Amino acid sequence: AQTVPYGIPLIKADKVQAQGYKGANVKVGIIDTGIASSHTDLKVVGGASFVSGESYNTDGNGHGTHVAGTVAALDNTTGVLGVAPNVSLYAIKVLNSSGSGSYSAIVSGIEWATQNGLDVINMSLGGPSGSTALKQAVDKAYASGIVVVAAAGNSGNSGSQNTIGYPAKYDSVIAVGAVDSNKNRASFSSVGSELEVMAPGVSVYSTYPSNTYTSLNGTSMASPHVAGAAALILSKYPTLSASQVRNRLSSTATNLGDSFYYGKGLINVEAAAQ
């Protein structure tokens, strides 16, 4: 039987799916450690690998497969349910199975999504420093009309210090922080003025290689709820621009507190999709 992880109802994605909008026709690229296509609850339609020796439809780390199941685990009678179960899912492998990737892999993975006309890209990954080439790649994806979403970082706060990673810190990228099921900001969620919205990131149950399920914590788990919310919005209003989708999610978020800590708050896809 299918389990619905708490994040789905928490962001009101169930209400939008009940209206019949489930992300069909929206191409979502998961830029991560790959996706285990072998998983019975996921359907990967394409992708690219920028990690030598590894193809994109395998995942020996598990992070990309977990992130993929939060956006798009199929709605059937098994496993879990994604935020946008009918999206066309692309595996863009830029990190190897030990979780290490180069700036150049990451830039090529973003450029690949831009050249291939994807609608939304999720980057549950980041580093303490960015690069010109990384900045030019995200700005070109957003300017081309792609909704670019990234995990803010799992560095917590350190006084006044902004701990948002790159690429989340770039203005063309939505930086997503993590809350638990009670709407508390997770202790590990990164903070800073670029923090834009919050989503479930604590004990998020989703798909895991090769064909299992597991609970993980991270802003990596939050980010996919926001990329899936963007796909639900585009399945309902297909011709909206990236900045219209982005403003609907932050403008309708439920305010949770100080924006250095919660950005505009917890996304509410029912309100955002009105």
Ligand X SMILES: *C[C@@](*)(O)[C@H](Cc1ccccc1)NC(=O)[C@@H]1CCCN1C(=O)[C@H](C)NC(=O)OCc1ccccc1
- Structure-token pair, residue 172: 């063309």
Identify the residue among 29, 85, 126, 263 touching ligand X (CB under 6 A).
Answer: 126
Per-residue binding letters, 73-112, with Ca ion (x by CB under 5 A): xx-x--x---------------------------------
Residue number, 176 or 216, with CB nearest to Ca ion: 216
Q: How far apart are CA 163 and CA 260, in angstroms?
A: 10
41 binds Ca ion (CB under 5 A): yes
List binders of ligand X among 13-72 (CB under 6 A): 33, 61, 63
Q: How far apart are CA 160 and CA 166, in angstroms?
A: 18
Residue number, 56 or 166, with CB nearest to Na ion: 166
69 binds Ca ion (CB under 5 A): no
Size of the site for ligand X (CB under 6 A): 24
Q: Which residues is 178 bridged to in the sheet?
A: 199
Residue 75, annotated as binding a ligand: no
Size of the site for Ca ion (CB under 5 A): 6
Q: Kindly name the residue from 37, 59, 63, 180 that is annotated as catalytic.
A: 63
Residue number, 68 or 134, with CB nearest to ligand X: 134
Q: Could you tell me the smallest distance in angstroms from the CB atom of residue 99 to ligand X?
A: 3
Task: Please state the separation of Cα 97 from the chain's center in Å.
Answer: 19
Binding-site sequence positions for Ca(2+): 2, 41, 74, 76, 80, 168, 170, 173
Catalogue the active-site residues: 32, 63, 220
